[PDB]
Each structure stands twice: as C-alpha cells, then as structure tokens.
Amino acid sequence: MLAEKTRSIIKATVPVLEQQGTVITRTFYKNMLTEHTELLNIFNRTNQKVGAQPNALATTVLAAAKNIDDLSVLMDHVKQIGHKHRALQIKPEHYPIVGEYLLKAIKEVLGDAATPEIINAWGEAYQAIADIFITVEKKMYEEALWPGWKPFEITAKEYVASDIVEFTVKPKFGSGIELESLPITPGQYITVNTHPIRQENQYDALRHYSLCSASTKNGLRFAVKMEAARENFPAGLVSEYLHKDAKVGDEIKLSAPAGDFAINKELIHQNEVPLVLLSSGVGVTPLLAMLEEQVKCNPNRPIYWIQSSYDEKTQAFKKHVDELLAECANVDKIIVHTDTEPLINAAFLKEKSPAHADVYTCGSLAFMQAMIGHLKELEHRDDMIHYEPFGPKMSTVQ
Ligand SMILES: Cc1cc2nc3c(=O)[nH]c(=O)nc-3n(C[C@H](O)[C@H](O)[C@H](O)COP(=O)(O)OP(=O)(O)OC[C@H]3O[C@@H](n4cnc5c(N)ncnc54)[C@H](O)[C@@H]3O)c2cc1C
Ligand code: HEM
Ligand SMILES: Clc1ccc(CO[C@H](Cn2ccnc2)c2ccc(Cl)cc2Cl)cc1
Structure with missing residues (x-):
C-alpha cells in the first residue's frame, strides 16, 4: 500500500516523533479540541492527564511508525480498537479531522524540519492507516445488534x-x-x-x-x-x-x-483442559458472565475461579459466584483478600493453577500488565492467555 520513498521518510522520522511525542500530542489535543469543541462529546479529557493517553499519540504513532514496514502485525489490536471505535460511534467522517490536526501538530512542533515531503508522507501514511480502521469498523457497524x-x-x-x-x-x-x-x-x-x-x-x-x-x-x-x-x-x-x-x-x-x-467455544465442551478465570476487583464482571456460560454449557469441565479483591466487603458477586460453583463437578475456588494476603504473583499462579490451562484474565491496566507477565514466565502459550483491560489495551502489549 504505502510507497518506499514515502515509507523511508516515515521510518527515518520516527526518532524525532518518538522524542517529541508528548509535545506533539499535547499540541494535537489543544488545537483540535478548542477548534472542534463538539468533539468533547466523544473524547474524555481526563484520559490525557491520567492513564495511558499522554504518550498515546506516541503509543499509536510510535507503534505505526515502528511497524510501518508491515502494518498487518498490528491487526489484532486494530480489531480490538475497532470494537471500541464502533461502540463509541466513531464514523468515517471523523478520521480526516484527526489526520488534519495530526499534520498540523507536527508542523507546529517540527517547524522547517517538517518539510512538504515529510508532511506529505505522513498525510499518506495516515489515510493508509485510517483506511484499515474504517474498513474493520464498517463490518462491525453492519453487524451490531x-x-x-x-x-x-x-x-x-x-x-x-x-x-x-x-x-x-x-x-x-x-x-x-x-x-x-x-x-x-x-x-x-x-x-x-x-x-x-x-x-x-x-x-x-x-x-x-x-x-x-x-x-x-x-x-x-x-x-x-x-x-x-x-x-x-x-x-x-x-x-x-x-x-x-x-x-x-x-x-x-x-x-x-x-x-x-x-x-474458546471449542474448549467448553471437554473436560481435559481446565478453564481459568483470573480477576481483580470489578474486573470480575465479564468473568462472571463467562463462568455462567461454562456452568450452563458443561459443568463437568475443571474450573479454577481466582478472584482477588481488597476485602470480603469489596468482593463482588459472592452470592452469584457461589451459586454457579455449587453446580459444577470439579472446581477450585480461590479468593484473594489483599488486606490479608499478598498480591497475586507467578509463584502463586504456579501453585494454584495447572501448567496447561485455558486462561481468561480481567481488571485494571496494571493487573493485566502483571498477569500477562506471570503467565508468560510460567510458559502458558499466548493462544491460551486472553485478557480485557479496564483501560487502553494499546498499553498492555509490549
Ligand atoms: C472493555 C472495557 C470494559 C469495562 N468494564 C467495566 C465494568 O464492567 N465495570 C466498571 O466499573 N468499569 C469497567 N471498565 C472501566 C470503565 O469503562 C471506566 O473506565 C470507569 O468507569 C471510569 O470512568 P469514570 O468516568 O468514572 O472516571 P474518569 O473521570 O474517566 O477518570 C478515571 C480515573 O482517573 C482519576 N482521575 C480523575 N482526575 C484525575 C487527575 N486529574 N489526575 C489523576 N487521576 C485522575 C479518577 O479518580 C478515576 O479513578 C471497562 C473498561 C473497558 C475499556
Ligand atoms: C487511525 C487512527 C486512529 C487510531 C490509530 C486510534 C487508536 C485508538 C486507540 C489505541 C484507542 C484506545 C482503545 C483501547 O486501548 O482499547 C482509541 C480509542 C479512542 N478513539 Fe481512536 N484511533 C483512531 C481514530 C480515531 C478517530 C478518528 C476518532 C474520532 C475523532 C477517535 C476517537 C477515539 C475515542 C473517543 C477513544 C476512547 C475514548 C477516549 O480516548 O477518550 N479515534 N483509539
Ligand atoms: Cl498514524 C496515527 C494517527 C493517529 C493516531 C491516534 O489518534 C490520536 C488521537 N486518538 C486517540 C484515540 N483515538 C484517537 C492521536 C493523533 C495524533 C496525535 Cl499527534 C496524537 C494522538 Cl493521541 C494513531 C496513529
């Protein structure tokens, strides 16, 4: 898709944009959001000042720019971003606005170093990237309930x-x-x-x-x-x-x-590979939904329920979980109160869950970070680890 002249420029100018990340992205939001104020009905201003959104430009630009050679390696994250974008009503028409300000930002920060070919090349790279998103998202739109x-x-x-x-x-x-x-x-x-x-x-x-x-x-x-x-x-x-x-x-x-x-729908209907549901705090929520499915589809599967919370009082879904676990042949209920016990470490997961296991994990940005690291060390295959962060997922990969 993108040309090698204009692809070379991109690779060559990633070091500048990586080093000037925060400034550009700050400039981007300042300008774009005070020009198009209606966009404040979409963007959450607090994301910029708290979580993983101060380097987000530099997350999503460094990712792109670094993977400009082969953009298909990011296709998994694009699909996940997609769900969020469609969910959020992001439409083909929004994309040019972003691009227009992205170039305007660079020009403001780089000055005469951002030549017409540099700007051009990014203008090009952008639409190429945006085109993948619009296409992924179009299918999601026509498929929404x-x-x-x-x-x-x-x-x-x-x-x-x-x-x-x-x-x-x-x-x-x-x-x-x-x-x-x-x-x-x-x-x-x-x-x-x-x-x-x-x-x-x-x-x-x-x-x-x-x-x-x-x-x-x-x-x-x-x-x-x-x-x-x-x-x-x-x-x-x-x-x-x-x-x-x-x-x-x-x-x-x-x-x-x-x-x-x-x-994994294929592993629901078998008893050899156990299901591990690994949650912290309110993260328990999709897992409760997942539990309810396994228990109803096949309660003979080995289930490991690993729920961490601060307290008994702050422990979500006590009645709900008990009732579903009562219905299964072979379960291990593992409740971690972090006011009494240490945070979950790799050591803990080794002892408390099986070496081969179909694992699903959910909670804060930070809880993911931790869990993915731990399971990677215990050498669970990537195919067997699945996760959903309660913040930006572009900052829970690498
Ligand atoms: C796929 C997905 C599923 C999710 N599912 C759930 C779910 O089932 N249940 C659930 O509760 N949440 C869930 N979340 C998280 C949820 O969507 C929101 O992110 C959450 O409710 C926070 O929104 P908020 O407007 O209350 O806080 P925000 O106003 O967006 O701020 C976020 C945090 O920043 C802090 N903060 C505010 N100002 C500053 C500042 N100036 N400096 C530093 N920190 C500051 C706040 O104290 C707050 O803790 C999910 C998220 C995703 C991405
Ligand atoms: C190719 C261009 C784009 C890329 C690479 C991109 C990337 C991302 C990423 C990585 C996230 C975080 C989601 C997650 O981690 O789960 C996100 C969320 C979001 N995107 Fe985009 N996006 C693009 C285009 C747009 C456009 C055009 C708009 C609308 C102007 C938009 C609006 C949002 C909003 C509102 C969120 C989450 C809410 C927030 O940040 O406050 N995005 N996007
Ligand atoms: Cl190639 C590319 C272009 C845009 C974007 C991500 O777009 C974000 C805004 N954003 C965030 C979430 N949804 C949209 C952005 C654009 C430009 C700048 Cl300078 C900073 C940021 Cl944060 C990613 C890769």
Missing part, C-alpha cells in the same frame, strides 16, 4: 459489593430492540452515553461496561465500581454520576455489545 445509541430504562439498582452497583437495564418503547433474541457472547461489554451533572461538566461522557450475564430475558446487567476521590484528585466522572445520580426509572443511552473478549 442495534444501530447507534438507543434509549433504555433503568429497571434495577443493586449493590453487589460495598462500592460496586449493578444496573439492570431494559430498552424503551420504540427503541426497536426486543430483549430476548439478542445474541450476547459472554465477555462483551456495552457502552453508555451519559451526561454528568456534577463537577462543572458540560459534555457527554462515554464509558464501556462489561455485561454480567449473557442472559437478556430480564434486562441487560452491568456493574459499576465507584472510582472515588479520597485525598487527591476528583472522582471518576461517570462512575460518580451513575452511583450518585442515575436513579432507577431514569433513561440511559447504550450502544450495542462490543468486544473480542470471549471464551
């Missing part, structure tokens, strides 16, 4: 731990969504479009929340941890909104189930 945001009604609010509530939600009249006959794969998340009233907030806020169950008869269920303030910065915007302000009976807007996180 329903188009865009649709109004749902909050039919129940229940604490399933001291600071995690579970919302059960039902589609409103004329949303055109019949609850039963919505095929959900356990491990998919939905995405909400809220508009918080606190903290001087003026725009929409979009967040993915993993479904607790693939069963839809009584509504869709998701569970939200309260990201509190404590002694430092402010509370998480939507988690506080949901917890404090979303009342049962209120409307909420959701987009269709997204995501790649799913258990």
Whole structure:
C-alpha cells in the first residue's frame, strides 16, 4: 500500500516523533479540541492527564511508525480498537479531522524540519492507516445488534459489593430492540452515553461496561465500581454520576455489545483442559458472565475461579459466584483478600493453577500488565492467555 520513498521518510522520522511525542500530542489535543469543541462529546479529557493517553499519540504513532514496514502485525489490536471505535460511534467522517490536526501538530512542533515531503508522507501514511480502521469498523457497524445509541430504562439498582452497583437495564418503547433474541457472547461489554451533572461538566461522557450475564430475558446487567476521590484528585466522572445520580426509572443511552473478549467455544465442551478465570476487583464482571456460560454449557469441565479483591466487603458477586460453583463437578475456588494476603504473583499462579490451562484474565491496566507477565514466565502459550483491560489495551502489549 504505502510507497518506499514515502515509507523511508516515515521510518527515518520516527526518532524525532518518538522524542517529541508528548509535545506533539499535547499540541494535537489543544488545537483540535478548542477548534472542534463538539468533539468533547466523544473524547474524555481526563484520559490525557491520567492513564495511558499522554504518550498515546506516541503509543499509536510510535507503534505505526515502528511497524510501518508491515502494518498487518498490528491487526489484532486494530480489531480490538475497532470494537471500541464502533461502540463509541466513531464514523468515517471523523478520521480526516484527526489526520488534519495530526499534520498540523507536527508542523507546529517540527517547524522547517517538517518539510512538504515529510508532511506529505505522513498525510499518506495516515489515510493508509485510517483506511484499515474504517474498513474493520464498517463490518462491525453492519453487524451490531442495534444501530447507534438507543434509549433504555433503568429497571434495577443493586449493590453487589460495598462500592460496586449493578444496573439492570431494559430498552424503551420504540427503541426497536426486543430483549430476548439478542445474541450476547459472554465477555462483551456495552457502552453508555451519559451526561454528568456534577463537577462543572458540560459534555457527554462515554464509558464501556462489561455485561454480567449473557442472559437478556430480564434486562441487560452491568456493574459499576465507584472510582472515588479520597485525598487527591476528583472522582471518576461517570462512575460518580451513575452511583450518585442515575436513579432507577431514569433513561440511559447504550450502544450495542462490543468486544473480542470471549471464551474458546471449542474448549467448553471437554473436560481435559481446565478453564481459568483470573480477576481483580470489578474486573470480575465479564468473568462472571463467562463462568455462567461454562456452568450452563458443561459443568463437568475443571474450573479454577481466582478472584482477588481488597476485602470480603469489596468482593463482588459472592452470592452469584457461589451459586454457579455449587453446580459444577470439579472446581477450585480461590479468593484473594489483599488486606490479608499478598498480591497475586507467578509463584502463586504456579501453585494454584495447572501448567496447561485455558486462561481468561480481567481488571485494571496494571493487573493485566502483571498477569500477562506471570503467565508468560510460567510458559502458558499466548493462544491460551486472553485478557480485557479496564483501560487502553494499546498499553498492555509490549
Ligand atoms: C472493555 C472495557 C470494559 C469495562 N468494564 C467495566 C465494568 O464492567 N465495570 C466498571 O466499573 N468499569 C469497567 N471498565 C472501566 C470503565 O469503562 C471506566 O473506565 C470507569 O468507569 C471510569 O470512568 P469514570 O468516568 O468514572 O472516571 P474518569 O473521570 O474517566 O477518570 C478515571 C480515573 O482517573 C482519576 N482521575 C480523575 N482526575 C484525575 C487527575 N486529574 N489526575 C489523576 N487521576 C485522575 C479518577 O479518580 C478515576 O479513578 C471497562 C473498561 C473497558 C475499556
Ligand atoms: C487511525 C487512527 C486512529 C487510531 C490509530 C486510534 C487508536 C485508538 C486507540 C489505541 C484507542 C484506545 C482503545 C483501547 O486501548 O482499547 C482509541 C480509542 C479512542 N478513539 Fe481512536 N484511533 C483512531 C481514530 C480515531 C478517530 C478518528 C476518532 C474520532 C475523532 C477517535 C476517537 C477515539 C475515542 C473517543 C477513544 C476512547 C475514548 C477516549 O480516548 O477518550 N479515534 N483509539
Ligand atoms: Cl498514524 C496515527 C494517527 C493517529 C493516531 C491516534 O489518534 C490520536 C488521537 N486518538 C486517540 C484515540 N483515538 C484517537 C492521536 C493523533 C495524533 C496525535 Cl499527534 C496524537 C494522538 Cl493521541 C494513531 C496513529
């Protein structure tokens, strides 16, 4: 696709963009977001100042630029980003805006070093990259269980731990969504479009929340941890909104189930390769959904439930989990309270799970980082390790 003249330039100018990453990406958001202010209905301003989004330009540009020789090596991450982008209603028309400001950023930072051929080459590289995304995302759009945001009604609010509530939600009249006959794969998340009233907030806020169950008869269920303030910065915007302000009976807007996180359907129906469900904190949520599937499809499979939380009180889904585990032939229930016990290490996973195992893991950015490292050392095949981070996945690879 991209030419070697214009491909050489790209390789040759990665050292500058890698070194000037933070500045460019800061310039990019400052400009783009104060020109197109409506975009603040999509981008979460807090991502830039907290998690993995200060080097995100330099994450997604260094990745591209470094892999410019062969872009297909990133295809897995593109597909995962895709689910998020479609979930978030990112459309072909958004892409040029990004590209336009990406070049404008570089020009501002590099000055006369960013020559017309340098700019040109990136302009080119960009559309090539964007074209892969638009195409991946188009297929996802035509395959979603329903188009865009649709109004749902909050039919129940229940604490399933001291600071995690579970919302059960039902589609409103004329949303055109019949609850039963919505095929959900356990491990998919939905995405909400809220508009918080606190903290001087003026725009929409979009967040993915993993479904607790693939069963839809009584509504869709998701569970939200309260990201509190404590002694430092402010509370998480939507988690506080949901917890404090979303009342049962209120409307909420959701987009269709997204995501790649799913258990291996071939290994469900056998008893030789055990299923390992490895979770921290609210991360337990898609795993609960996955557990419910295994228990219902085949309860003879060996299951290892490895749930970590701070407390018994902060331990999510105690009733729910017990009840499902009671139904299986051979389980090992492993509950880690980090107020009493050490964090999960490789040593721990060796002793507590089998050497050959079909493993699924979920929780914070940091919990993933750790778990993937541990399982790699114990030499679990990559095919056997699967994970879904509760932040940006482009920063939980390499
Ligand atoms: C695929 C996927 C599935 C997910 N599933 C779930 C789920 O089932 N349940 C769930 O609870 N979450 C889930 N998450 C995480 C969730 O979507 C949100 O990321 C989460 O609710 C936080 O949103 P927030 O608006 O409340 O916090 P934000 O306002 O987005 O801020 C995030 C964090 O930054 C901190 N912060 C705020 N300001 C600053 C600052 N200035 N400096 C440093 N730190 C700051 C806040 O305290 C907060 O902890 C999932 C995420 C993904 C990607
Ligand atoms: C080829 C160009 C693009 C690339 C490489 C890219 C890459 C990424 C990556 C890596 C993430 C993090 C998701 C995760 O880790 O799970 C992300 C999320 C996101 N993308 Fe893109 N994206 C592109 C285009 C766009 C466009 C055109 C828009 C709209 C203007 C957009 C809006 C968003 C939003 C809103 C998020 C998450 C929410 C946030 O960051 O606040 N992206 N993208
Ligand atoms: Cl080749 C390429 C172009 C754009 C992007 C990622 O686009 C991000 C914004 N973003 C983040 C999430 N969704 C969109 C971005 C563009 C430009 C700059 Cl300078 C910084 C960033 Cl962070 C990735 C590779």
